[PDB]
Structure formats: structure tokens, C-alpha cells
Design a protein that fits this description.
part of a larger assembly; 8 chains; A mainly beta; B mainly beta; C mainly beta; E mainly beta; B: mainly beta; 4 strands; E: mainly beta; Jelly Rolls; five-stranded antiparallel sheet; binds palmitic acid
Chain lengths: 268, 59, 57, 59, 255, 268, 57, 255
């Protein structure tokens, strides 16, 4: 609950709250009462919306890819990593160390591709989503034994009903998801540099179980991340400069802020 | 966001008397300003920020 | 084995929650943890500095 | 001045008169160009509403 | 009785005295402490000298001119070539320590200026060119202060770090650097700045050579000014003292 | 519960309930018993239907818009405001100050547009509805990063199942939804005048997630408002004159009531 | 934690209600609040005026 | 603990901070207080805002040159054209208030000088010519500081006030002005002067327009001196705050 102001009356004392020393590195907490007379106003406002859990707990689309029922690309492959979407990456970059569980929803939408094949009879498409942890086998082809998934987790979904959704625990060899890593892979100090060192989260594949019809059909899958039970450590300043690459923090230098007319202008 | 129905006000700083210096000392100085919130700050209705944007998926 | 808690309503009614999955990572997001401690970031100095005092005596 | 360290400095010099103005800006933390890139402003640009006091520390 | 501007600090066999200093800032409210038994992961016995490892090492001094943009230091790298702390972090595999940072810049009553001393944890820095990443010889300078730049670095292919000052190299507003433990040395009042950073990392222990946690940054927000007749060479000194240092995994010398 | 009449018998007294003074501004509450003999009839009738909650708690369609899978208009934009539908606006105008929560249901219906493209294979259309609060980004195009919705609320809906529905709390900087505002925006007294001053509720966009087929498909979305936990203050007289604009109360003068033959006619 | 209340039936039977959502703005519409006070609009005068009395003596 | 040179004063919605100030002088030992019921004479109800009326109004600043004789202000007249105090004393007939006087003149360590700030009650002033009396446009200056004169004013017929400084205009030795509540602002130590004058008058309430009780006088006993290289424009500011103000006799606007 938000604090409430306390009523105050005219004062004339040597001690002065307003005058302090900002060189100490201390934020001087001054109630409006110190610099002017105030009346007792109770505050019934709450800080409920601000909490880290309510700020980060909203579904956001990390990446979307496409696959075709018949054609050169029959299966889709994506290395599961964040930093591909600016909206979520910026929100996560606020804290150096983060630790959260995750909820994943897959919005799969199909569409017909233009062709010349006649006598089309569309049938309910079925989509299989598979997750390969770092080290497992890779389906070099859309039809391969790897798709048996004797151990890997997978989800099958027929088109027409509610989207798939699963919950994922905190998968990390450390004690927190590091967002920034100022170091190299080799102790030699030569090699991969940056956060891409700590990205070994696996890969996610998707395919069509059954060929829908004779005419070509293209399906696009979108992946949504929902942080749950989130904990944040070491707060950091907000980005400011637009992102360029998804493997590092390389950027182009940009002005501190938008300019105005003069130093006494009240309008942008 | 800007709305004339909820205009804020104006913060202005004025010279009270002067800035007097002795001999052999610079007569042009600088002042810095920090902004912070009081113990009674609150926010509501989470929305997307209009600052960050992406043309395509970074890769 | 149900859990009854209070709802977030205006100022100036109980709701029911039951866990069905046995992994403890499937529970709903805990949204009501309104606790704070701004002493770590603001006023982090070693020696206490009272408000109305010459910060540097 | 926004492309150097001179944006955070407010100039003040020994004048020949008194009562002139040093600076001024509207109270628009989530909108004005002055408070847009401050931590307070960066936090406010995520939430539609805001309320409370403000503390300007001048050094 | 006494005043708050005077302070004395003793560590190992070294002492630091200040007569015009502000209040010490103690990290995020945590004083550095040894690794407890309910948090460790290495089953080997650790070594803790706590005298040779913990003491005030004085680094090289840099000159503060009227057109100086700022300097940055890496705490694990700077002390890697100085004393038994360097010898130990070199003969071991895992290390853990907190640090005490003291910055000394003194000027008379007729000088003016202001410095920001900030300890940024995990300061990944962007390269000048988007495709390349910075090299190990450009990012960290052993017992050397890497200076910044007033104008943007060229975008031509290179392994140079982006040293533009109004972005701090990490791509942020230099104004919002305050969120981290920081001190202000204004030549009007303060003559020194003290910081006490605990061990901030996402693992119990990490290798010092391939991971530099804290990056001290000094930024002159308000430039230095004076009139003819005053001394123009005003230096800046930085003294770093390790605290509660321990190690694990004794291995053959590695450099 | 409705009150019941009390039995009365012939009276001959100086005090007269029927004669009063209407200049005082007081409604003389006279039971039928005062002006004639009455018998004791118990009333079991109830005033349950009349209550403000039961009067305003019925779903009503505020606005409907159209978007096309392929064509110039691929996304729809609507500023969320009332006063576009006469049936609900008239009901709300009864009280000067209102305060209610809201329930929103979106009836999305697609249809095929006439064309010449052959070999059509229709696929389940998916519709995304997004709400941008006042200040957020705007999707200048149907395909844009804004549609990631890292913070904004959104709903995805596949065609074929129950319609979407969400509950919205009381969003107002004041203490009540003002229905009438006799003032300007500028303190200068020149500028926007009327209720349009207090309408900053945001915007609502909608789009097709996946192109359904080769042939053009047009979809229309209707929005329904359902007030909940409603409170009303300061009752007002009913409209009478038909509405003209959705930004003010401008009207064309109309007769008090429909006329009849004479002053003693019993028929319209 | 269920709430049992009465149903609206004719004159001259309990129903059950459980809240599942923890926002307190998702509850069903409260329809049974049959309370009134017509003294504000009718008979709003400052001095009480009894029914059978010369309103202006 | 703390020192006595630092003071903060809050009134209404205004605040005054001083870091090199002497002890406040409180009139003749009486803090201003409202009119008690055993002393009043007006049978009407008084109006007391106590927020808009009571606050620090800052007047116009005057320059202190090496050849400045002094300045005088009338407390009722100076604030007559500033804020609701002016509007109220204009719409009423009887007014009553005490005043807080703050004078601000700051100089570096290399300047020298001394000012006398004295609140003279009932300061009747002699005209330049014995037959005539001073006019209303020469005696009081609304929100303006009337300066004195180093040499005697001409005795030719006129309505000019006798502005000679070594007689203070009232025909007294400027040396004996100390009897009244007074403060010394020496640029060697003091930077500000605070005075608290209660309501001193021979009646419970009086009309402000036709009677100005207190006349603030600033007299530079020791002139200002400096060497070439220091700033020559040293201003003087005066802030007046009413206290415990009340009024009686609401009448049509009168000016
Ligand atoms: C059908 C597949 C189900 C399982 C899919 C799991 C994919 C996500 C794995 C965990 C990723 C957690 C986030 C890592 C990136 C980060 O923390 O920045
Ligand atoms: C998928 C979108 C979900 C959210 C949509 C919210 C749209 C409605 C916002 C609140 C409007 C409340 C009514 C304001 C107008 C009035 O009171 O007259």
C-alpha cells in the first residue's frame, strides 16, 4: 500500500531537510511536508500493478517460422533463444540476473498456396512439435526415425481447436538465467564472446503429420513465452539504442534524448 | 501521454541575487539535476513502450 | 484440499484455488506478493544519515 | 548538445543583472523530451497512468 | 567529538587515510562474506590467506585534462599482474572475492569539476562493427586504464570496442548509470570516493580469467576548469583491495 | 417489496391530505386511502426488475467494422468510445455520473467475396484482437512488429467455436465515468468542447493471422458491452430528440410530443 | 469455500456460487440489491411537511 | 550534531534556506499572534486565510555599488501590488499582520563590506523644505526601493523627502538607529539577515493604505571594496512574509 502524507504547520528551525549532500551517493527522501505546509491526505492507492511478476507475466511472441506440406522446406528448425524480438528482450534486459519458469503457447495457422492442381479435397492438417535438448539427434529430413520421440517431449495438434500450451521449469546449470556475460568461452580469451556463450537451450522442430491435400498448403507457427514465478536481481538501466544482432549487444551510437527549441521552451 | 485535461504545470529556476567569484577563479559554473519519485508514487494500466522497434526478427 | 484466499478489489469476496498437477511448476502465477525494501538501492550508505541533519558536519 | 556530455550540464555565470531565468520545463515525466530518457521516464513509458510527488535534486 | 569527513581504512598491512571524504557506499547493503557450507558446490578444500590476497594495491595514475572523456577498469584483470592475488588467481581454477574501490583526485579551492565513480556488474560492451565482437587486447587492459572517446568509433570492420562516452559502450543512456552503486567526487567538497562491492555473480565460484564481473567506470560529467596560474596536471589514482578471497582447484600455472 | 394499501372508512375531519402546495417543490405522497375508502389488499409484487443493475446489465452492440484477408484494408482500427449506438447511449444518458465494470464479447463472422480465382481451398481463419491504451504504438500496417503484444492485452480466436469474452475493470482517472462535461480542454475556454474532452480510452485493432485461401474473404467483427456492478448518480431527464453526432449532443429541435384531435379526444 | 444464497422465486431452493478468478472484477453481476431511498428526489424539502396539514400555514 | 549557521524557514508554500546565517532576531521578544477577544473593538467577524496571505514574497533587487548610500522600504506599501495580500488589503478596511524580513546579499571571501538592516516603527520623514510636507509619490515606492543621498537635499520649495543618509531622513543620528531590532550582514561572515517584527501600533487594527507602520532601512556603514578580477555586480534581495494576517470591514474595491 502507498504511504500517506502527514499534516504539517509553519516551522522556523536550524535543521534543514532540503539541504543535503548528493556526493555521498544517497537519495534524500523528502516528504512534501518538509518544503511546504501539507494536509493529512490518506492514500488508498496500491503498487499492485508494478510488481516484477505482473510486469513480466504477459504472453509475448519470440519467433515465427513457416513450413510447407509439399516442397523443399517440409519441416522447420529453430534454436530456442530469446533476443530475437525487441519488445520482450528489452523487458528482460532490465535485470542482469533473472530466474523464471515458462509457459509456451503455439499459434499454428495454415493457408493455401496458389497453384494449378484441380480437384482439391482439403483434410484436417495435423501438426507435430518436437523439442531436442542439446546433444540429441536431429531430423536431417521431414521423414526420419528421430520423429518417434521415444524420450523427447512432443505435442500433436489437429487444426480446429484450442491452441497447444505447456509449462517448462527453470532449465539452467547455474542458479539463474544470466542476461549479460562479459567473458569468452576459451580461458585463452579468444573465441565466442558475450551472452552467446550461455545459450545451449536446445532446438525446436515442427512438421506436418499428414499431407493435407494435392494442392500446396503453407503453415506458419508462432511461439509465445509467458514467465511465471519470476525473481530478478541487480537492476540495470534501460536499453535506449535499437538492437542490431541477436547474438550480442552490438549497436549504433544514438543521441541521449530528442531535442527542443531552447533551454526555456515548454514545448517539444 | 499528453492531454490538456491533465496538464501538469511548469518548473522554472530564477537567479536570486547573483553568482559572485573572487579573483583568479572561473565565473562560469555548471549545475546538475537528478529526478526521483517520492514514497507515494504509483503506476497503472501496463502498455507497450513507443521507444523500441524492430523491422525484422534480428538474426 | 482447497485453498481459499482474498480477491484484489477496490478500496473505500473470497476465491477458491485447487492444485491439480503434481509437478509444482504448473501452479498459477503468484501475483499477490506486495513486499518491498528500497533500502538496497536508495540510502545504501554505511553510516545512517538522518533527514534533517548537515549531511557533512 | 544531445550528442555529448554537455546535455546534462546547466550553464550558470556571473551576470550584470538579476531576476533572469536559468531553465524551465513542463511537468510531463512520460512525454516531455527532458524526462523521457530518465529512469523514472523509462519506467513511466510502460504504464498509462501515474500519480505521486517528484523530487528534483540540484547539485 | 569528531567529524564524518575523516576516515581511516586498514586491510592486511596497508592503510588509507582521508580527511575530506563522503560516506562509504556498501554495495547493495551486503558486506562481502565467505562462502557458506549450504551454498558451495566444489567438494575440494579452499585456500584462504586473507592477508597477502587482501590488501590495497595501487594502480597506475591517469591525467585529467579539460578534454578527457572517461576511463574504465576490469577488477579481475587489473590485479592479475600484481602480487600474490595475481599469482593465486593464476595457479587456481575457481576464485571468489569482493572488492573495495578507492579513487583519489585532489584539487585546490580554485578548481572545479565533477567525476562519477560507478561499479557496473557484468558490463558486456558492443563492438564498433555489428558483425565482429571486441578482442581481448582492446576490451581489458592489464594495469592500464582504457580511455573512452568523445565522438562515435568508425563502423569499418575492426575488433575495436565502441568507446563513445554518451553511451558507455554498453548501449545505454550514460544518465541512467546511477542505478549501480556510485559516488560523486566534486572538487568543491569531496576529494575521494570509496565503494564496497560484494561478490555479484550467478554461480558460487567462477574462473577469473574468462569472466570479469565488475567494471569500474570513471566519467567526468562536468569538465575541469581553472584560470592561468594554477597547476594544470591533476592526476587520478585508483586503489583496489580484495576482501574475503578464496580459491579452489589447484592446477599447473596457466597464463 | 412493494408496499400494501391499508383499509380506511368514511371520514369527516378538518385536516385534508389532498390539498397541498406544489410550489414548495415537494411530491405529495397520497395513498388511495386518503381520497376514497379502500380495502386491505396485500401486495406480493416486487420491484426486482427495475433495479439499475438489471436495467443496464444486458449485452448491447456498440460498433461493428470490416477487414479483408487480401486487399487495401487488411486490418481494422476503432477508437473505443460509446455514443455510436443510440439504444445503449440513450440508456446510459439517463444518469449524469455512472461507474461500472464491463464485459466484452466479439462476434466475428467471415464471408466469401465474389471473384474469378479458381481452385479455392478454404482454411480455418484465425482472428487476432489487440487493445492499444492511449500512448502506445500503432500498427501502421497489418504486418508490423507492434502485433507482438509484449505488454498489450490481446485475444486469438479460430473460427468454429464459442465467441471470445473478457472482463474489464473501471478504467478512469476520476472517480466515475462522466457522461456530460460542460467545459473546454484549454483553460483559455477555446478548444475541444463537451464530453469529447474526457474520451481517452484507447484504440482497438483486429486482423487476420493467416490468409485463409486464394479467393478474397471479408470478415466483420461486432463489439458487445455488458455493464457489471453498476452505480449511478444524479438522475437526468430522457433524451427525446434523435442523436446526430458521436462527439457532442448537437441536435435538431423537435416537438414536445405527438399531437391529437382536440383537448377532449380519448384517441390518438 | 462455497457461498450458498437464496433464489428469486414467486410468492404465495438454495443455490451455490463459487468464485474461481482472483481479480474480484470477474465475479458475476450482483442482481439482488433491492434497496431504495426515495427521500432524496421526492419530499427533499428542509422542513418536514406532514401529509394532512396546511402546507403553507 | 548540527551547527547554528544553517537555518530553514517554511511558510505557506514557500521555503527559505540559509547556510551562513546568524541568530534570528524576534522583535521585542514577542512572536506575532492573532488578536485576542479581550482586546478587539470591531464587532464584525474577521477573515483569516493564513496561507495565501502568509508566504514569502520576493521583491525587486537593487545593486550595491561602492558609492551607494542606502535604501528604505514600506512593508504595507511594498506588498500592496503582489498576490492576495494586495487584493485583501485592497478590498477591506481594517488589517492586522506581523512581518518576517529576510535580506540576501552574498559575496566571496575576497569582498568586504557591512550592511545594517533595521525595522523602524512609525518612521515619519522630514521634507526638504520646512514649509512643505513630502508627497505620496516620493515617500513610498510600490515594489521599488527608494535610495538615499550622500549630500543634503536642496532647500528650494519642493515635496522631495530629505534623503540625507547621516540623518536617516527622520532627523536623528544614524548611529543611534540600533535601539530598534537590527541585524548586521558583514560579507566576512554573515550572508543573510532575518528579522521577525510583531504588530506594533497604538490601535488594535488600522487602515494599511493611509498608515505604514514599519519602514525597513538598509544602510551600508562600511563601503564595498574589491580588487580588479572579482565580480562587480553584487545585488541585494529582500523577501517579506506576512504572519497572522486578518482583516475586517469588507468594502467595494478601493485603490
Ligand atoms: C513440444 C516442446 C515442449 C518443450 C519446449 C521447450 C522450449 C523452451 C526451453 C526452455 C527455454 C527457457 C528460456 C531460455 C532463454 C533465456 O532464459 O533467456
Ligand atoms: C482484446 C482487447 C481486450 C481489452 C479491450 C478493452 C476495451 C474497452 C476499454 C474500457 C472502456 C470502458 C468504457 C469507456 C466509455 C464510457 O465509459 O463511456
Amino acid at each position: 500500500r502507498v504511504a500517506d502524507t502527514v499534516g504539517t504547520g509553519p516551522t522556523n528551525s536550524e535543521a534543514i531537510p532540503a539541504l543535503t549532500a548528493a556526493e555521498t551517493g544517497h537519495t534524500s527522501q523528502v516528504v512534501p511536508g518538509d518544503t511546504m505546509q501539507t494536509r493529512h491526505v490518506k492514500n488508498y492507492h496500491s503498487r499492485s500493478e508494478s510488481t516484477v511478476e505482473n510486469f513480466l507475466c504477459r504472453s509475448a511472441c519470440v519467433y515465427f517460422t513457416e513450413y510447407k506440406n509439399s516442397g523443399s522446406k517440409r519441416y522447420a528448425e529453430w534454436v530456442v533463444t530469446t533476443r530475437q524480438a525487441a519488445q520482450l528482450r528489452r523487458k528482460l534486459e532490465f535485470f542482469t540476473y533473472i530466474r523464471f519458469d515458462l509457459e509456451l503457447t503455439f499459434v499454428i495457422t495454415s493457408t493455401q498456396q496458389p497453384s494449378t492442381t484441380q480437384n482439391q479435397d482439403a483434410q484436417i492438417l495435423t501438426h507435430q512439435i518436437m523439442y531436442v535438448p542439446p546433444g540429441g539427434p536431429v531430423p536431417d529430413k521431414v521423414d526420419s526415425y528421430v520423429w518417434q520421440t521415444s524420450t523427447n517431449p512432443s505435442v500433436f495438434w489437429t487444426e480446429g481447436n484450442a491452441p497447444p500450451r505447456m509449462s517448462i521449469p527453470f532449465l539452467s546449470i547455474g542458479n539463474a538465467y544470466s542476461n549479460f556475460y562479459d567473458g569468452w568461452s576459451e580461458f585463452s580469451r579468444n573465441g565466442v564472446y558475450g551472452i552467446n556463450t550461455l545459450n545451449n537451450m536446445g532446438t525446436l522442430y515442427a512438421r506436418h503429420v499428414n499431407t493435407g491435400s494435392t494442392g500446396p498448403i503453407k503453415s506458419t507457427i508462432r511461439i509465445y513465452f509467458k514467465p511465471k514465478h519470476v525473481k530478478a536481481w541487480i537492476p540495470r538501466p534501460p536499453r535506449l539504442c535499437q538492437y542490431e544482432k541477436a547474438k550480442n549487444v552490438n549497436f549504433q551510437p544514438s543521441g541521449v534524448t530528442t531535442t527542443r527549441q531552447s533551454i526555456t521552451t515548454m514545448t517539444n | 501521454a499528453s492531454d490538456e485535461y491533465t496538464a501538469g504545470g511548469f518548473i522554472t529556476c530564477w537567479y536570486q541575487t547573483n553568482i559572485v567569484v573572487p579573483a583568479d577563479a572561473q565565473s562560469s559554473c555548471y549545475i546538475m539535476c537528478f529526478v526521483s519519485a517520492c514514497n507515494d508514487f504509483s503506476v497503472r494500466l501496463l502498455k507497450d513502450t513507443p521507444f523500441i522497434s524492430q523491422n525484422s526478427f534480428f538474426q | 484440499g482447497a485453498q481459499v484466499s482474498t480477491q484484489k478489489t477496490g478500496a473505500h469476496i473470497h476465491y477458491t484455488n485447487i492444485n491439480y498437477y503434481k509437478d509444482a511448476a504448473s501452479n498459477s502465477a503468484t501475483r499477490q506478493d506486495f513486499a518491498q525494501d528500497p533500502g538496497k538501492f536508495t540510502e545504501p550508505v554505511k553510516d545512517i544519515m538522518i533527514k534533517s541533519l548537515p549531511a557533512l558536519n | 548538445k544531445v550528442n555529448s556530455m554537455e546535455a546534462y550540464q546547466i550553464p550558470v555565470r556571473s551576470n550584470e543583472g538579476s531576476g533572469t531565468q536559468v531553465f524551465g520545463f513542463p511537468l510531463q515525466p512520460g512525454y516531455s523530451s527532458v524526462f523521457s530518457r530518465t529512469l523514472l521516464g523509462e519506467i513511466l513509458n510502460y504504464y498509462t497512468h501515474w500519480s505521486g510527488s517528484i523530487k528534483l535534486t540540484f547539485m | 567529538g569528531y567529524s564524518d569527513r575523516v576516515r581511516s581504512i586498514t586491510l592486511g598491512n596497508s592503510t588509507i587515510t582521508t580527511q575530506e571524504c563522503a560516506n562509504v557506499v556498501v554495495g547493495y547493503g551486503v558486506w562481502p562474506d565467505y562462502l557458506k557450507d549450504s551454498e558451495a558446490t566444489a567438494e575440494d578444500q579452499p585456500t584462504q590467506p586473507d592477508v597477502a590476497t587482501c590488501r590495497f594495491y595501487t594502480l597506475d595514475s591517469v591525467q585529467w585534462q579539460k578534454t578527457s572523456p572517461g576511463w574504465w577498469w576490469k577488477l579481475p584483470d587489473a590485479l592479475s599482474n600484481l602480487g600474490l592475488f595475481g599469482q593465486n588467481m593464476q595457479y587456481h581454477y575457481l576464485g571468489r572475492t569482493g572488492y573495495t574501490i578507492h579513487v583519489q583526485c585532489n584539487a585546490s579551492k580554485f578548481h572545479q569539476g565533477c567525476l562519477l565513480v560507478v561499479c557496473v556488474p557484468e558490463a558486456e560492451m558492443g563492438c564498433a562493427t555489428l558483425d565482429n565482437t571486441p578482442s581481448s587486447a582492446e576490451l581489458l587492459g592489464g594495469d592500464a586504464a582504457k580511455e573512452f572517446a568523445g565522438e562515435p568509433i568508425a563502423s569499418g570492420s575492426n575488433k575495436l570496442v565502441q568507446r563513445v562516452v554518451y553511451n558507455a559502450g554498453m548501449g545505454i543512456g550514460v544518465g541512467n548509470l546511477t542505478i549501480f552503486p556510485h559516488q560523486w567526487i566534486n572538487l568543491r567538497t569531496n576529494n575521494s570516493a570509496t565503494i564496497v562491492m560484494p561478490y555479484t555473480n550467478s554461480v558460487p565460484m567462477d574462473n577469473m580469467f574468462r569472466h570479469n564481473n565488475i567494471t569500474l567506470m570513471v566519467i567526468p560529467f562536468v569538465p575541469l576548469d581553472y584560470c592561468p596560474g594554477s597547476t594544470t596536471y591533476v592526476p587520478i589514482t585508483v586503489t583496489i583491495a580484495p576482501m574475503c578471497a578464496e580459491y579452489n582447484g589447484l592446477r599447473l600455472a596457466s597464463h
